[PDB]
Ligand binder design. Structure first.
Ligand SMILES: Nc1ncnc2c1ncn2[C@@H]1O[C@H](COP(=O)(O)OP(=O)(O)O)[C@@H](O)[C@H]1O
Ligand SMILES: Nc1ncnc2c1ncn2[C@@H]1O[C@H](COP(=O)(O)OP(=O)(O)O)[C@@H](O)[C@H]1O
Lengths: 473, 473
């Protein structure tokens, strides 16, 4: 038994499927605008704005929908970013294409035009950006704040934004004549019962553990250990293995002993501390997880009180800890989704070296280049590029509607202001509800995120229009 | 198989759910007004006014309702207080918002206005309060009586209210330049066959247990014990362990031995008495739960007759026992729900240092600030703040209806009296049925309870209006 889907109706089925998952996500384009909740047959409950977190658990009848979703999920695994933009832009590209099919243009022509215009967009993004460097700290703070916002505590966390910017500046280097970073150089530590005021940067490694042993050690080495630190003859051999640590490793100054009972008395009579931490310490200290070799080095080691409880510190400088003591485990959980995402957002700026506005105004400027390229092509392909420009202009029309404005009137006012070239960066403000300068408002995005969004959208819609027939076996 | 809820109809479903649990609790806003009964499929029966005790056992089809209930239950776990006010205020905020949706204001705008006004309310509460201190004993007695009332025995328990106020005054200290208390410094003891006249305060620890041993001991130490107090050689070792208590612990004066058979004769030939009590004794005496160490100290120890039967007493001064000998176990059970709740109510006053009226008049005064802030904002947001003020004015309209008055007429009369600024504290009296001075009537509430009520309500209704879509998997 085998099942088949055919002809114009196969396009109407697959276009309907992508319009359906668009409709299921259209309202949630952020940052202000309503959110969605998902519940288990076990009776469990979740509330989220985040499309990537939604598409982790959506329900998917048509295979082409599942495949488009897979492409979006891959885009998020590369970036964590743009994930809602890609699906929405794909959805509107697909719908506006349906308006051509009544004029009976053969689908391969549309797939030509929708591919060709994407060259002009991709070129135009690389034209209009401005440069940025590690030194440009207030612009980096604007970038961090734009990634951090849509939770009111982002105003209080404005000093926490400066902490991660300086942590990046210490993590950052040059490679390929470009500023160079990755996230995994930054350590984070996390305890409850604190506040935003507890938060710190360390320029070193933090050991979030509580221990006769000394509070302070200086100019010393470090021992890293996997797991913990003839009957009578073999009994004493495992006593000797303690002093065999002293005999060479203490004689060279390894004043702290870090483990994943006789030593607890003996070393107190030297500090002992109870895999990722041992890797971070191996990166910072040069140590490795007996042998007389494998030793790490540091100038300072301490245990100190940090809010409600004690913590241990080791103080290579190219890795940096930041310290969080939040009020609750709820705050730690959301501090990943805020802070590690913000750090990654900044790193993608650092590795781009260039930046663009975000007020939808990048998109409107692309629309103005497109309507000047299309008359040069002039074939039937022209109706496809004019459609593409109108469909991407169809994005901010949605974004304004989530700010409750009447969209058409604000769209025409915006385009009228943009027509005179009055600004490079006029766009649509979601709080004042007005056409405003989006750059002085401080709303910034990396150009890479636009490129990967527009790319993933065009890839998805070609994989819809290019399919004639489905068979199942 | 997956289930989905959508569009305007998802709001009408979720608004209907919160209107339903409001309707299921609307009539029970206290203190005079009808109550509700809950019965098991096992045939068991309960009668209560207390919403927190009701929401311990309600039936909950919609998840958003369950989640709003969870927020109310959390509010009660923090406070035990305000629990009905939060739900009712949320319910009316939700209903009055429905009257805007026919004018097609986008829900995000309403959520803006309902958030913005809450700043003006929160500021206004902190403006109008009056200060209070430990010294202000008759005002503290009014506070206690207002927490104690709606059981007629509160008139007889007016001296019992003075006992817990003085127990607090002995428990209380300064911390952070503020008067400081917590409940867990007060011991309570509980026997049957007595009366309100049996009740006492002790400035010490009471041991509610009946024992050749002496009736009185003075200037002595205390032994606290976990659980009770080579065959022949090890037999006698457990005889020696009795005199080993004498050999150091009696030689230093530990005349009472407190346990969670040879000693019953031997010590009579010293007092022996048969986890929370041992912790309370550890707090008062400095003792700890053989060793020669761990000893407690007190100036006086006694066993004495207390109504129907004997009781033992130990007499650090910063913990205080109060003594209850009620007529029945029914009285002890309700004496938690009265007395420990009243003590907590007072402590929340002590730690606020400030106080507000309760006659609904705090709420009406907020309504008068709001209608003067709203014309400055002036956008579409104005229709949301004017609605919020009208909806919170909608609270006392219910409270008067539980006193059987015709509500509209009393509301207009009240607002007319409040308009002229005739009083800071005119409100609505539930017994005389008249507009009266609520402060001279002695009806007092802590400002914290209002803050946490208005806060939890606004949090709940935003979590309703902010949801567009539900999916179940
Ligand atoms: N506060 C803001 N003001 C204006 N535009 C914004 C704001 N926040 C985000 N945007 C725009 O919204 C789009 C990003 O959508 P968003 O849901 O934030 O994506 P993501 O969830 O991946 O961050 C871009 O056009 C971005 O510039
Ligand atoms: N005897 C009273 N006279 C006037 N208002 C009262 C009286 N008792 C309570 N109130 C008011 O009722 C509201 C408290 O509702 P209530 O059911 O008592 O809450 P709770 O059950 O948490 O004590 C507040 O407005 C409070 O001031």
């Amino acid at each position: 038994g085998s099942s088949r889907t055919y002809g114009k109706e196969a396009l109407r089925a697959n276009i309907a499927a992508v319009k359906a998952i668009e409709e299921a996500l259209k309202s949630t384009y952020g940052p202000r605008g309503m959110d969605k909740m998902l519940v288990d047959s076990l009776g469990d409950i979740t509330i989220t704005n985040d499309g990537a977190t939604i598409l982790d658990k959506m329900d998917l009848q048509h295979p082409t929908g599942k495949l488009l979703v897979q492409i979006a999920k891959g885009q998020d695994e590369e970036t964590a970013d743009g994930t809602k933009t890609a699906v929405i832009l794909a959805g509107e590209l697909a719908k506006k294409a349906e308006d051509l099919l009544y004029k009976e243009i053969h689908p391969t022509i549309i797939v030509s035009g929708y591919k060709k215009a994407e060259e002009i967009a991709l070129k135009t993004i690389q034209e209009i950006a401005q440069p940025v460097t590690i030194n440009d700290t207030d612009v980096l703070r604007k970038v961090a704040l734009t990634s951090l916002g849509s939770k009111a505590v982002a105003g209080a966390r404005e000093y926490l934004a400066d902490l991660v910017v300086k942590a990046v500046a210490q993590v950052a280097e040059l490679r390929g004549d470009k500023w160079y970073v990755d996230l995994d150089n930054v350590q984070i530590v996390k305890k409850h019962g604190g506040s935003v005021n507890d938060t710190q940067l360390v320029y070193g490694i933090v050991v979030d553990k509580e221990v006769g042993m000394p509070k302070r050690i200086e100019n010393a080495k470090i021992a890293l250990l996997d797991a913990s630190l003839q009957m009578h003859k073999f009994l004493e051999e495992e006593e000797n293995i303690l002093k065999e640590k002293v005999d060479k490793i203490a004689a060279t100054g390894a004043n702290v002993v870090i483990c994943q009972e006789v030593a607890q008395h003996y070393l107190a009579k030297i500090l002992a501390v109870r895999k990722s931490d041992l890797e971070k310490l191996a990166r910072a200290t040069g140590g490795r997880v007996l042998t007389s070799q494998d030793l790490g080095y540091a100038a300072l080691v301490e245990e100190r009180k940090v809010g409600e409880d004690k913590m241990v510190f080791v103080e290579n400088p190219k890795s940096v800890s930041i310290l969080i003591r939040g009020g609750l485990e709820r705050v730690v959980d959301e501090t990943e989704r805020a802070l590690r995402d913000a750090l990654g957002t900044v790193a993608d700026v650092i590795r781009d070296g260039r930046a663009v506005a975000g007020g939808g105004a990048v998109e409107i400027e692309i629309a103005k280049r497109l309507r000047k390229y299309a008359p040069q092509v002039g074939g039937k392909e022209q109706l496809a590029i004019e459609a593409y420009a109108n469909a991407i202009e169809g994005l901010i029309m949605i974004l304004a509607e989530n700010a409750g404005l009447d969209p058409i009137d604000k769209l025409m006012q915006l385009r009228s202001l943009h027509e005179n070239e009055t600004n490079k960066w006029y766009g649509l403000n979601l709080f004042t509800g007005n056409p405003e300068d989006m750059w002085k408002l401080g709303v910034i995005e990396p150009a890479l995120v636009k490129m990967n969004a527009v790319k993933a959208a065009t890839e998805a819609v070609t994989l819809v229009l290019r399919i004639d027939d489905i068979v199942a076996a």
